[PDB]
Amino acid sequence: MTTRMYVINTLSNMHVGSGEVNYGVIDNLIQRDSVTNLPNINSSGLKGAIREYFKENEDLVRELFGSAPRDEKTLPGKVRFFEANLLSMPVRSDKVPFLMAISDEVLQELITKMKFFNCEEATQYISHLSTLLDNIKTQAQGTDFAYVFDPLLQGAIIEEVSIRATCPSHIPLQPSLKKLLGDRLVILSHKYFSILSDDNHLPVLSRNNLENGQSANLWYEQVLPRYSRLYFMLMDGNAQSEYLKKFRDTLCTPSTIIQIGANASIGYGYCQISELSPF
RNA sequence: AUUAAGACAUUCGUGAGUGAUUUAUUUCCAUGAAGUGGCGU
Protein backbone atom coordinates (compact mmCIF):
# COMPACT_ATOMS: atom_id res chain seq x y z
CA MET A 1 0.00 0.00 0.00
CA THR A 2 1.53 3.27 -1.23
CA THR A 3 -0.66 6.35 -0.82
CA ARG A 4 -0.22 8.81 -3.68
CA MET A 5 -1.43 12.37 -4.21
CA TYR A 6 -2.75 13.27 -7.66
CA VAL A 7 -3.55 16.79 -8.87
CA ILE A 8 -6.27 17.33 -11.45
CA ASN A 9 -5.85 20.70 -13.24
CA THR A 10 -9.15 20.83 -15.11
CA LEU A 11 -8.75 21.99 -18.71
CA SER A 12 -12.39 23.10 -19.09
CA ASN A 13 -15.42 23.99 -16.97
CA MET A 14 -16.30 21.23 -14.50
CA HIS A 15 -19.89 20.37 -13.58
CA VAL A 16 -20.34 17.53 -11.10
CA GLY A 17 -24.01 17.28 -10.14
CA SER A 18 -24.80 17.50 -6.44
CA GLY A 19 -28.27 15.95 -6.64
CA GLU A 20 -29.29 17.32 -3.23
CA VAL A 21 -32.41 19.38 -2.54
CA ASN A 22 -31.96 22.56 -4.57
CA TYR A 23 -34.31 25.51 -4.10
CA GLY A 24 -32.33 28.58 -5.21
CA VAL A 25 -31.82 30.51 -8.43
CA ILE A 26 -29.41 28.06 -10.06
CA ASP A 27 -31.14 24.87 -11.20
CA ASN A 28 -27.97 22.76 -11.51
CA LEU A 29 -25.49 23.07 -8.63
CA ILE A 30 -22.08 21.46 -8.20
CA GLN A 31 -20.93 19.13 -5.45
CA ARG A 32 -19.67 20.88 -2.32
CA ASP A 33 -18.03 19.51 0.80
CA SER A 34 -20.30 18.99 3.79
CA VAL A 35 -17.76 20.25 6.33
CA THR A 36 -15.99 23.10 4.52
CA ASN A 37 -18.58 23.88 1.80
CA LEU A 38 -15.83 24.08 -0.78
CA PRO A 39 -16.19 22.48 -4.23
CA ASN A 40 -15.19 18.83 -4.32
CA ILE A 41 -15.56 15.65 -6.36
CA ASN A 42 -16.89 12.44 -4.85
CA SER A 43 -14.62 9.42 -5.08
CA SER A 44 -17.48 7.73 -6.94
CA GLY A 45 -17.11 10.27 -9.74
CA LEU A 46 -13.34 9.84 -9.79
CA LYS A 47 -13.61 6.05 -9.97
CA GLY A 48 -16.26 6.27 -12.68
CA ALA A 49 -14.25 8.67 -14.84
CA ILE A 50 -11.03 6.66 -14.53
CA ARG A 51 -12.85 3.37 -15.18
CA GLU A 52 -14.54 4.83 -18.26
CA TYR A 53 -11.21 6.03 -19.62
CA PHE A 54 -9.57 2.63 -19.04
CA LYS A 55 -12.61 0.54 -20.00
CA GLU A 56 -11.00 -0.54 -23.29
CA ASN A 57 -8.39 -2.53 -21.33
CA GLU A 58 -10.71 -5.02 -19.64
CA ASP A 59 -8.04 -6.80 -17.59
CA LEU A 60 -6.73 -3.57 -16.04
CA VAL A 61 -10.28 -2.53 -15.11
CA ARG A 62 -11.03 -5.93 -13.58
CA GLU A 63 -7.78 -5.91 -11.60
CA LEU A 64 -7.89 -2.36 -10.26
CA PHE A 65 -11.49 -1.13 -10.23
CA GLY A 66 -13.30 -4.46 -9.92
CA SER A 67 -16.26 -6.13 -11.60
CA ALA A 68 -18.89 -4.28 -13.60
CA PRO A 69 -22.39 -4.15 -12.09
CA ARG A 70 -24.87 -6.87 -13.02
CA ASP A 71 -22.00 -9.34 -13.33
CA GLU A 72 -22.47 -12.86 -12.01
CA LYS A 73 -19.13 -12.87 -10.17
CA THR A 74 -18.19 -9.90 -7.99
CA LEU A 75 -14.52 -8.98 -7.60
CA PRO A 76 -13.34 -6.31 -5.15
CA GLY A 77 -11.46 -3.26 -6.28
CA LYS A 78 -7.79 -2.91 -5.47
CA VAL A 79 -7.39 0.89 -5.68
CA ARG A 80 -9.20 3.05 -3.14
CA PHE A 81 -10.10 6.52 -4.40
CA PHE A 82 -10.48 9.44 -2.01
CA GLU A 83 -12.51 12.58 -2.60
CA ALA A 84 -10.94 15.39 -4.60
CA ASN A 85 -10.60 18.67 -2.69
CA LEU A 86 -10.24 22.06 -4.35
CA LEU A 87 -6.63 23.23 -4.10
CA SER A 88 -6.51 26.43 -6.16
CA MET A 89 -8.99 28.32 -8.33
CA PRO A 90 -8.63 31.06 -10.95
CA VAL A 91 -9.78 34.48 -9.75
CA ARG A 92 -10.08 37.47 -12.04
CA SER A 93 -7.54 40.29 -11.93
CA ASP A 94 -6.64 43.49 -13.80
CA LYS A 95 -2.87 43.32 -14.37
CA VAL A 96 -3.13 39.68 -15.50
CA PRO A 97 -6.04 37.72 -17.03
CA PHE A 98 -6.46 35.64 -13.88
CA LEU A 99 -4.71 34.64 -10.67
CA MET A 100 -4.55 31.26 -8.95
CA ALA A 101 -6.18 31.66 -5.54
CA ILE A 102 -5.48 29.48 -2.52
CA SER A 103 -6.53 30.12 1.07
CA ASP A 104 -4.37 29.62 4.14
CA GLU A 105 -6.98 27.20 5.49
CA VAL A 106 -6.84 25.16 2.28
CA LEU A 107 -3.05 25.06 2.67
CA GLN A 108 -3.29 23.98 6.31
CA GLU A 109 -5.83 21.28 5.46
CA LEU A 110 -3.52 20.05 2.69
CA ILE A 111 -0.64 19.89 5.18
CA THR A 112 -2.80 17.98 7.66
CA LYS A 113 -4.02 15.56 4.98
CA MET A 114 -0.48 14.87 3.75
CA LYS A 115 0.65 14.29 7.34
CA PHE A 116 -2.33 11.99 7.94
CA PHE A 117 -2.13 9.93 4.74
CA ASN A 118 1.69 9.72 4.52
CA CYS A 119 2.04 10.52 0.85
CA GLU A 120 5.15 9.27 -0.91
CA GLU A 121 6.66 12.76 -1.34
CA ALA A 122 5.17 14.11 1.89
CA THR A 123 8.30 14.98 3.87
CA GLN A 124 9.83 17.82 1.84
CA TYR A 125 6.44 19.15 0.75
CA ILE A 126 5.18 19.28 4.34
CA SER A 127 8.37 20.99 5.52
CA HIS A 128 8.32 23.65 2.80
CA LEU A 129 4.56 24.26 3.04
CA SER A 130 4.81 24.62 6.82
CA THR A 131 7.63 27.15 6.44
CA LEU A 132 5.56 29.05 3.86
CA LEU A 133 2.50 29.09 6.12
CA ASP A 134 4.50 30.25 9.15
CA ASN A 135 6.10 33.05 7.12
CA ILE A 136 2.67 34.07 5.79
CA LYS A 137 1.17 34.15 9.28
CA THR A 138 4.12 36.18 10.57
CA GLN A 139 3.68 38.68 7.73
CA ALA A 140 -0.10 39.00 8.12
CA GLN A 141 -0.19 39.11 11.94
CA GLY A 142 -3.88 38.28 12.19
CA THR A 143 -5.07 40.65 9.44
CA ASP A 144 -6.66 39.98 6.08
CA PHE A 145 -3.98 39.35 3.49
CA ALA A 146 -3.60 38.88 -0.27
CA TYR A 147 -0.01 37.90 -1.01
CA VAL A 148 1.52 37.51 -4.45
CA PHE A 149 5.14 36.47 -4.85
CA ASP A 150 6.14 37.71 -8.29
CA PRO A 151 7.20 41.37 -7.93
CA LEU A 152 5.48 42.11 -11.25
CA LEU A 153 2.06 40.99 -9.96
CA GLN A 154 2.29 43.50 -7.10
CA GLY A 155 -0.80 45.68 -7.04
CA ALA A 156 -3.09 43.18 -8.74
CA ILE A 157 -6.77 43.70 -7.92
CA ILE A 158 -8.93 40.65 -7.30
CA GLU A 159 -12.19 41.58 -8.98
CA GLU A 160 -15.08 40.13 -6.99
CA VAL A 161 -13.56 41.05 -3.63
CA SER A 162 -11.96 44.44 -4.18
CA ILE A 163 -8.70 43.41 -2.51
CA ARG A 164 -5.36 44.72 -3.76
CA ALA A 165 -2.56 42.17 -3.66
CA THR A 166 0.69 42.90 -1.83
CA CYS A 167 4.13 41.39 -2.39
CA PRO A 168 6.16 40.60 0.76
CA SER A 169 9.75 40.11 -0.36
CA HIS A 170 10.57 38.02 2.73
CA ILE A 171 8.47 35.05 1.55
CA PRO A 172 10.20 32.68 -0.92
CA LEU A 173 8.10 30.40 -3.11
CA GLN A 174 9.95 27.24 -4.10
CA PRO A 175 9.68 26.06 -7.73
CA SER A 176 7.98 22.80 -6.75
CA LEU A 177 5.43 24.60 -4.58
CA LYS A 178 4.77 26.82 -7.60
CA LYS A 179 4.29 23.69 -9.71
CA LEU A 180 1.87 22.19 -7.18
CA LEU A 181 -0.20 25.32 -6.50
CA GLY A 182 0.00 26.83 -10.00
CA ASP A 183 1.35 29.92 -11.70
CA ARG A 184 0.37 33.51 -10.89
CA LEU A 185 -0.51 32.48 -7.36
CA VAL A 186 -2.23 34.58 -4.70
CA ILE A 187 -2.62 33.41 -1.10
CA LEU A 188 -5.69 34.90 0.56
CA SER A 189 -7.53 34.69 3.82
CA HIS A 190 -10.13 31.94 3.88
CA LYS A 191 -12.90 34.54 4.08
CA TYR A 192 -11.92 35.88 0.65
CA PHE A 193 -11.63 32.37 -0.81
CA SER A 194 -15.02 31.37 0.61
CA ILE A 195 -16.53 34.50 -0.93
CA LEU A 196 -14.89 33.73 -4.28
CA SER A 197 -15.99 30.06 -4.33
CA ASP A 198 -19.56 30.54 -3.10
CA ASP A 199 -22.71 30.24 -5.20
CA ASN A 200 -22.79 33.98 -5.91
CA HIS A 201 -19.31 34.23 -7.47
CA LEU A 202 -18.97 30.89 -9.23
CA PRO A 203 -19.72 31.01 -12.98
CA VAL A 204 -23.39 30.49 -13.82
CA LEU A 205 -24.27 29.66 -17.43
CA SER A 206 -27.68 30.05 -19.05
CA ARG A 207 -29.05 27.20 -21.15
CA ASN A 208 -32.22 26.81 -23.18
CA ASN A 209 -33.81 24.22 -25.47
CA LEU A 210 -35.09 25.50 -28.82
CA GLU A 211 -38.09 23.78 -30.41
CA ASN A 212 -39.01 25.15 -33.85
CA GLY A 213 -37.22 28.42 -33.17
CA GLN A 214 -38.67 29.11 -29.71
CA SER A 215 -37.28 28.19 -26.31
CA ALA A 216 -39.02 25.24 -24.69
CA ASN A 217 -37.01 25.10 -21.44
CA LEU A 218 -34.59 27.37 -19.60
CA TRP A 219 -32.23 26.63 -16.73
CA TYR A 220 -29.02 27.94 -15.18
CA GLU A 221 -25.87 25.88 -14.69
CA GLN A 222 -23.08 26.20 -12.14
CA VAL A 223 -19.61 25.22 -13.36
CA LEU A 224 -16.22 25.05 -11.69
CA PRO A 225 -13.96 27.56 -13.48
CA ARG A 226 -11.47 26.43 -16.09
CA TYR A 227 -7.89 25.73 -14.90
CA SER A 228 -8.95 24.88 -11.34
CA ARG A 229 -6.78 22.43 -9.38
CA LEU A 230 -7.98 19.59 -7.17
CA TYR A 231 -6.01 16.97 -5.24
CA PHE A 232 -7.08 13.47 -4.26
CA MET A 233 -5.47 10.39 -2.72
CA LEU A 234 -5.09 6.95 -4.28
CA MET A 235 -4.33 3.80 -2.30
CA ASP A 236 -3.24 0.62 -4.08
CA GLY A 237 -4.13 -2.56 -2.22
CA ASN A 238 -0.87 -4.15 -3.35
CA ALA A 239 -2.39 -4.71 -6.77
CA GLN A 240 -0.42 -6.40 -9.53
CA SER A 241 2.69 -4.36 -10.21
CA GLU A 242 2.43 -4.36 -14.01
CA TYR A 243 -1.21 -3.26 -14.11
CA LEU A 244 -0.46 -0.61 -11.49
CA LYS A 245 2.51 0.73 -13.43
CA LYS A 246 0.54 0.77 -16.69
CA PHE A 247 -2.32 2.61 -15.00
CA ARG A 248 0.01 5.17 -13.41
CA ASP A 249 1.94 5.72 -16.66
CA THR A 250 -1.27 6.23 -18.63
CA LEU A 251 -2.60 8.56 -15.93
CA CYS A 252 0.55 10.69 -15.92
CA THR A 253 1.17 10.83 -19.66
CA PRO A 254 0.51 14.29 -21.18
CA SER A 255 -1.73 12.89 -23.94
CA THR A 256 -4.32 11.52 -21.48
CA ILE A 257 -7.36 13.69 -20.73
CA ILE A 258 -10.08 12.54 -18.32
CA GLN A 259 -13.72 13.63 -18.43
CA ILE A 260 -15.35 14.01 -15.00
CA GLY A 261 -18.91 15.21 -14.56
CA ALA A 262 -21.77 16.07 -16.88
CA ASN A 263 -21.99 17.74 -20.29
CA ALA A 264 -19.31 15.55 -21.86
CA SER A 265 -20.51 16.23 -25.41
CA ILE A 266 -20.06 19.98 -24.90
CA GLY A 267 -16.65 19.60 -23.27
CA TYR A 268 -17.25 19.97 -19.53
CA GLY A 269 -14.89 18.52 -16.96
CA TYR A 270 -11.95 17.65 -19.20
CA CYS A 271 -8.86 17.38 -17.02
CA GLN A 272 -5.34 16.01 -16.86
CA ILE A 273 -3.89 14.09 -13.91
CA SER A 274 -0.55 14.89 -12.28
CA GLU A 275 1.23 12.82 -9.66
CA LEU A 276 3.18 14.44 -6.84
CA SER A 277 6.56 15.22 -8.35
CA PRO A 278 9.53 14.69 -6.00
CA PHE A 279 10.51 17.96 -4.36
C1' A B 1 -12.36 -12.16 4.28
C1' U B 2 -15.47 -8.21 8.03
C1' U B 3 -24.35 -8.26 7.38
C1' A B 4 -19.55 -8.14 1.77
C1' A B 5 -18.62 -6.59 -3.83
C1' G B 6 -19.74 -3.73 -7.98
C1' A B 7 -22.26 1.73 -9.80
C1' C B 8 -19.48 9.54 -12.72
C1' A B 9 -26.68 12.71 -10.59
C1' U B 10 -25.63 10.77 -16.04
C1' U B 11 -28.04 11.09 -21.76
C1' C B 12 -30.73 14.64 -24.90
C1' G B 13 -31.15 20.64 -24.90
C1' U B 14 -28.50 27.43 -29.42
C1' G B 15 -30.81 32.44 -24.00
C1' A B 16 -34.31 32.31 -27.98
C1' G B 17 -38.60 34.21 -30.47
C1' U B 18 -41.69 39.44 -32.42
C1' G B 19 -39.06 45.04 -31.90
C1' A B 20 -37.02 51.58 -37.87
C1' U B 21 -33.91 55.80 -31.82
C1' U B 22 -38.72 57.21 -33.13
C1' U B 23 -43.29 61.08 -32.61
C1' A B 24 -43.10 66.71 -32.46
C1' U B 25 -40.21 71.80 -33.69
C1' U B 26 -40.52 77.68 -40.14
C1' U B 27 -32.85 79.54 -39.61
C1' C B 28 -37.01 83.56 -38.07
C1' C B 29 -37.60 88.77 -36.20
C1' A B 30 -35.40 94.56 -37.70
C1' U B 31 -33.98 97.95 -41.19
C1' G B 32 -36.05 103.50 -47.20
C1' A B 33 -30.07 101.76 -52.20
C1' A B 34 -30.60 106.02 -50.21
C1' G B 35 -28.36 111.99 -49.21
C1' U B 36 -26.73 116.10 -52.05
C1' G B 37 -25.58 120.22 -56.85
C1' G B 38 -22.69 124.32 -57.86
C1' C B 39 -20.27 127.99 -60.41
C1' G B 40 -21.93 131.05 -64.79
C1' U B 41 -24.09 136.82 -58.89
Side-chain angles (χ1 to χ4, degrees):
Chain A
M1 270 128 276
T2 49
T3 322
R4 271 150 201 303
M5 193 168 126
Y6 290 72
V7 197
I8 281 197
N9 179 253
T10 98
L11 306 191
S12 62
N13 311 269
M14 178 101 59
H15 185 72
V16 205
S18 57
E20 67 57 24
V21 278
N22 166 21
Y23 269 144
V25 179
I26 312 107
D27 315 68
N28 296 336
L29 295 171
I30 62 172
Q31 282 167 350
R32 293 174 167 275
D33 205 340
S34 303
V35 277
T36 56
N37 205 77
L38 275 172
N40 79 327
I41 314 173
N42 285 336
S43 42
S44 309
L46 284 174
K47 200 163 185 295
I50 308 302
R51 171 188 266 256
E52 194 183 15
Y53 184 85
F54 285 95
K55 79 178 177 184
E56 292 302 330
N57 191 9
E58 300 56 359
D59 267 355
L60 196 135
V61 161
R62 158 185 334 300
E63 173 81 16
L64 299 178
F65 310 106
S67 56
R70 329 228 318 270
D71 269 0
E72 286 328 343
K73 64 166 336 195
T74 65
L75 300 60
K78 288 186 170 46
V79 280
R80 174 74 211 272
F81 280 86
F82 289 86
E83 54 147 355
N85 301 97
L86 188 80
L87 184 54
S88 51
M89 202 188 27
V91 295
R92 215 153 41 72
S93 182
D94 62 321
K95 290 186 61 63
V96 285
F98 63 91
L99 288 168
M100 278 288 142
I102 190 172
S103 74
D104 58 328
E105 293 197 15
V106 158
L107 266 183
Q108 186 72 48
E109 172 55 33
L110 171 62
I111 292 185
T112 308
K113 209 177 298 293
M114 289 202 283
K115 211 170 309 177
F116 181 47
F117 275 90
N118 203 26
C119 305
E120 277 209 353
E121 315 289 338
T123 309
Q124 305 113 304
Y125 268 108
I126 281 167
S127 169
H128 286 78
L129 279 173
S130 292
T131 54
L132 176 68
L133 262 183
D134 278 60
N135 292 340
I136 278 170
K137 292 217 216 83
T138 300
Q139 190 78 26
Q141 278 169 352
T143 48
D144 307 326
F145 55 97
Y147 291 145
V148 298
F149 305 106
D150 215 21
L152 317 174
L153 310 184
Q154 148 95 20
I157 291 176
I158 303 102
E159 204 87 339
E160 283 82 17
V161 284
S162 291
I163 306 306
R164 181 178 302 277
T166 68
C167 180
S169 100
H170 259 58
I171 323 290
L173 188 57
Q174 312 286 335
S176 295
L177 289 192
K178 210 166 180 182
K179 191 173 183 295
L180 176 70
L181 313 181
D183 203 5
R184 286 171 167 167
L185 185 79
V186 57
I187 316 201
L188 305 155
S189 310
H190 194 53
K191 43 196 301 298
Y192 294 144
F193 194 64
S194 293
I195 295 195
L196 293 162
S197 65
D198 73 347
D199 290 322
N200 299 280
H201 303 89
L202 273 192
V204 186
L205 307 177
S206 52
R207 306 273 314 272
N208 70 349
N209 178 31
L210 296 205
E211 188 174 358
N212 283 320
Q214 279 120 6
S215 94
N217 313 102
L218 165 84
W219 72 105
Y220 287 77
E221 262 189 347
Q222 204 178 35
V223 281
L224 190 67
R226 193 171 81 234
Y227 291 156
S228 305
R229 287 179 180 261
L230 307 99
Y231 70 98
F232 69 96
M233 304 272 175
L234 193 46
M235 258 178 22
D236 39 342
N238 289 339
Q240 189 172 357
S241 297
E242 53 160 355
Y243 286 141
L244 217 45
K245 83 165 297 301
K246 177 148 50 180
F247 157 74
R248 192 195 310 183
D249 285 359
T250 318
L251 214 57
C252 265
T253 185
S255 77
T256 280
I257 298 183
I258 286 81
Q259 205 266 327
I260 319 179
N263 297 315
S265 53
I266 70 177
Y268 284 21
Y270 276 94
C271 44
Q272 278 177 336
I273 307 278
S274 303
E275 217 164 352
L276 215 60
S277 315
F279 207 105

